[PDB]
Design a protein around this nucleic acid. Structure first.
Ligand code: ZN
Ligand code: ZN
Lengths: 118, 50, 88
RNA sequence: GAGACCGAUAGCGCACAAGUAGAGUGAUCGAAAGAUGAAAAGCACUUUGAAAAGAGGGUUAAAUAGCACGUGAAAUUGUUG
RNA sequence: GAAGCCAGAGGAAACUCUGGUGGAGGCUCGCAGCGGUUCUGACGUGCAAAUCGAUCGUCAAAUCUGAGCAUGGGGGCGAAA
RNA sequence: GUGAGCCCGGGUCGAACGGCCUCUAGUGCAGAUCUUGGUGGUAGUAGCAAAUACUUCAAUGAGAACUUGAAGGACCGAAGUGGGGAAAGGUUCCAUGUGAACAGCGGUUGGACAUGGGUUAGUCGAUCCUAAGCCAUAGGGAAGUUCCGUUUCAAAGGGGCACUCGUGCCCCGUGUGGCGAAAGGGAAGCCGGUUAAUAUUCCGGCACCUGGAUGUGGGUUUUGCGCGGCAACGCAACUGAACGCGGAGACGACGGCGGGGGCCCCGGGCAGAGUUCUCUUUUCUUCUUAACGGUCUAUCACCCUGGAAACAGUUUGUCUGGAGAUAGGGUUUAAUGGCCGGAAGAGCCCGACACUUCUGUCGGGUCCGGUGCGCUCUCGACGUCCCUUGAAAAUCCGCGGGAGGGAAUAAUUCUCACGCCAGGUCGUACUCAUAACCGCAGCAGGUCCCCAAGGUGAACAGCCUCUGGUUGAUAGAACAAUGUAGAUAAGGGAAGUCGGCAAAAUAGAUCCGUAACUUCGGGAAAAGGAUUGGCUCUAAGGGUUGGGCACGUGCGUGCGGUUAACAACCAACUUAGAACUGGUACGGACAGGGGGAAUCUGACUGUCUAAUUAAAACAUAGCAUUGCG
RNA sequence: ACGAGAUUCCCACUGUCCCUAUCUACUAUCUAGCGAAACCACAGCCAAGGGAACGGGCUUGGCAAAAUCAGCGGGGAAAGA
RNA sequence: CGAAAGGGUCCUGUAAGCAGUAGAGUAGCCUUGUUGUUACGAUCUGCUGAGGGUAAGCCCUCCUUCGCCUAGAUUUC
RNA sequence: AAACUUUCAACAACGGAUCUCUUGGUUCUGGCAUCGAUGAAGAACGCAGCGAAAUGCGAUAAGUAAUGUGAAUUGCAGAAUUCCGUGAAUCAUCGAAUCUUUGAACGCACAUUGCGCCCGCCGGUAUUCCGGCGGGCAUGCCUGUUCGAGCGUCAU
């Protein structure tokens, strides 16, 4: 049986856009099939980890699939992971509480200074 | 090559249409001096220079 | 190996076809014609080459409009039709 | 419109499908090459050959002019003496 | 067969010895490729205006290579001949 | 006629020319290695000798070594003499016909010559994007051709609102355009068939992408813009302007390890073929499954419980863990994995009839396993190196925000399913080379890539073979000298020669053993030794599955035991040991270091005089000096 | 340490010789077909003499017989001399 | 005379095939070993100085076979 | 004696000199002033019943109109011409036209038959989609128009 194959396009060089895989046809023939580059997993904007639940596709393939397949039902879903979202929530709450505390302390010091001046 | 521009293919088409011997009735005209195609081209002899 | 062996590596093109003059003298990397000087507005010519001037001077081509000018001058650049001529 | 000019190795590179054919990556370089006959009348027909052609036989004023074609020198060659 | 690592035996510890593991290097033998050392080599109006055979250097990199682009003669480029 | 010359005869030939006196000049050839053209001897001479090789019959034809068919014999031997491409060529492609010329012979043949025919795309490239780089604009130089400039010392423009003092007002800042890749980036097509020649382009079947319009079904909503899960997150939907954030595009080299496809290998079965003196339940061939989808699964990682020293988990490679390990239970990125649709109706194999052709018709089958330090491509998790850290843009998506728009006269501005419409331009033949490109040529040179079978063997070494290609390079006869290429030679063993030049000797692998010197890394395969065939055995080195009770009822507890140290089944290649046996040889061809003592010399790896010099030359790391805030 | 750098020696090894012999292929050779070039004042047997240190041709002698083939490398020719 | 063949003379080294209480050992079947037996198994032994080659520049052969023959062409005091 | 080599002659070859010819050069003289954004010179690609070139021409393509002449063209084919005529012709003249893609070359580009923008018209079910056709869109500068900007100078 003829086991050797050829390119099916006019590019003869083994570049990154010239990837092929070997198939066997229903006609019993060994042939190549030109395939695209592998899709890349989307990554978290804060830590860079791969986001669970999101498909890894070439960039224009995301326009063909529906919204719930491209995201996670959470704030910053499909853009940031759950640990980073939890860190954002805790940091935001604690920093605004500390701002309230600092404003109380500044008002107390200002009142003490005004009482000392008066 | 197989890849070619339209301009190059037009020049090749004109060369292909020019590549012929003269019609035989040319030699029978009154006062004819043309005996053969003095500008005949062959793909192994003279390059088109494109 | 500077002769016959080195001549086997000649498969590129310094020059292509020029749109203005038609010769194979358009430098593919400079985009400048060695013969006619395209894309400069003036046609390239020099007084040290009388032969090159006479190869491309007026009259070497078709003279599509210029060959009719002496007849129009001889008849005085007239307009109109002969008197009583057929027409509209 | 002309010449005490040149007459196809001369005269323009070019008397001719000459700035052509051809060469060079390119700028550029750049030839050779005219003449059957008054008229194609450019050889019917027969014959030998696979053919090219040959031989007869016409055509012509002449083929000692056969699209190798006016004339046809020399070098050099064949045959004959 | 470099660092790193495991085990065993010592040593107060640092370390020392033994057996493994690991896979470093402008390291090495060597195929392709790249190069071009030698031969009273072949060839010498050649297959070739530098070719052919055997042999040889290098072979994971200061390695080999295509296309696009840049540097133009008072110049360029040059591990410099 | 002294002579340069003049005149006549004969022959050939076909249209003009001469004497005398003056005038006029591009006016007289043996030479210039002249100039152009033509022609000899040499001479039927030198050759027409790399790439292993040809032979028989028949046909065609005037004619056959180099045409064709059959019959043989060989070669390329998968880094090909194979199957396709990039550059370059441009019709060389296919059919028919053919005088000369060309194919250094011959030619009936041809890439030659003559007449015709052949290249079919929304999905393959171009076209788009930007890279290194190049060119306009503003502006400034230059006598000027033009030079610089590409974000600048530029008024270099987008959006929204408005019934009024109606002929306005508001918001925003980022700059400036174009060219530049048929190997970078990038929306989307597969299989079967079909021609003399095109095919992921034609035909048939089955799909996909992009954009547009507008329906139906389904979804959401009277708690207006979904529900579920502790969570990771899921699900057919499930609003989202300005202005922002983020991801993808988007990325080095090398090392071993693991997963998957294809190839290679092994066993059985049906069908066909070959072998058959003897043997061989034999040797060989078909036994296939695309894009696109559905569904169930697949390392990393993440989540929940819980709290670890008698530290534990764990890779070939020592990393991980109170910043929460192990364990148990889950969630997810990732298919070239399994099953199903596609799809057996195809393709392939076999058989039985029919058949002047036109044309075919009908049956049977296409199945089940195994293996691996194999080859190749791809994916994943690791690791190493850097005074080296290994593109950009077009383009697509997610999120933050909450502007608008939204219901029971029902509404819907739903990334869900189905349905409707549309997709322009070229390029597409063929060669890619011992004859299609460059080298003046059909030149032993040169010229960028994939795909890559079996045996031997460490091995894309050498040698032999399969598929697929060739059998093409002037032939016949003879076997002198001298050659070129390949070999052998008794005895001696470098006496040869300027010089051991050349040749010979060595060589794989296992084992014993290995000096001086040394920058401690090397030297080192130093040196010097012992062995190797065939056959018949022996031993060692693995994988998978599988525990008794008591209750509820094939799962949950409460126990109990670590001799499963046992059984059943399956599997491959290495290593060691022993007997027997042939021998002139045992790495039996092939392949394959001679070694040692020293001296000079440049540190080393590297580089140059393409076409006489490859080196103590150049470079190099290291070192030193000078200048500059 | 490394080296296609230059040199001397040792062991092994042998057709380097001593001393040459033999075998194979391809040539050379013969035939069919095909078919150049370099070079060429004219030509090609010598000896002695030919003042200018040179004879192929002159003088005097030796002599001297068609047409040819394979070799050969003394002159004569032959080095992009 | 030629082509075969036969005999001789030389060269090599014992053919194919069959068989064997030869053969290190291994595995089966049973009499469980008493050539226990059968199967395989390099090699060994016998048939077998056998097979093969032998003039191409070896020898012999009226009396071992088959074939060929008094030409053709050219030239000559 | 032949053959061979050489010499002489005749005929035949080879080759293209000589002679004669010349729709060509060369030089002199005389006359004339007329290229282009109303797109030149030049380039490419095409056009004939049967053409490769030269010549002529431009999709109206070896040509159309008009004027004049007055019977061809011719290599073949096919047709002529009411010849007493709106009429042959590869005819002459030439005032009317056609004049592809380009080129100073002009929407932006061009190594691409690449990409646009504006305004009309027509066709295909068509308010939205698809297709065809027509006319336009370079730069510098002048004159004018109209819309503007700036406490630059003022008036109110
Ligand atoms: Zn994160
Ligand atoms: Zn030009």
């Amino acid at each position: 049986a003829p086991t050797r194959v050829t390119y099916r396009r006019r590019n003869p060089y083994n570049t990154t856009s010239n990837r092929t895989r070997v198939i066997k046809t229903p006609g019993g023939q060994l042939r190549v099939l030109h395939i695209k580059k592998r899709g890349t997993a989307p990554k978290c904007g804060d830590c860079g980890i791969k986001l669970p639940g999101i498909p890894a596709l070439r960039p224009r393939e995301y326009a063909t699939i529906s919204k719930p397949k491209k995201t996670v039902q959470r704030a910053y879903g499909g853009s940031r992971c759950g640990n980073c979202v939890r860190d954002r929530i805790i940091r935001a709450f604690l920093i605004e509480e500390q701002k309230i505390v600092k404003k109380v302390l500044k008002e107390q010091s200002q009142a003490e200074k005004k009482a000392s001046k008066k | 090559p197989s890849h070619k521009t339209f301009r190059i293919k037009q020049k090749l088409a004109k060369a292909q249409k020019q590549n012929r011997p003269i019609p035989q009735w040319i030699r029978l005209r009154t006062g004819n001096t043309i005996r053969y195609n003095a500008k005949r081209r062959h793909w192994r002899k003279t390059r088109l220079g494109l | 190996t500077k002769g016959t062996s080195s001549f086997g590596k000649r498969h590129n093109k310094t020059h292509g076809l020029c749109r203005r003059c038609g010769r194979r003298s358009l430098h593919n990397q400079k985009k400048v014609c060695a013969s006619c000087g395209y894309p400069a507005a003036k046609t390239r010519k020099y007084n040290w080459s009388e032969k090159a001037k006479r190869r491309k001077v007026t009259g070497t081509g078709r003279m599509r409009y210029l060959s009719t000018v002496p007849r129009r001058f001889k008849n005085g650049f007239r307009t109109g039709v002969p008197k009583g001529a057929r027409g509209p």
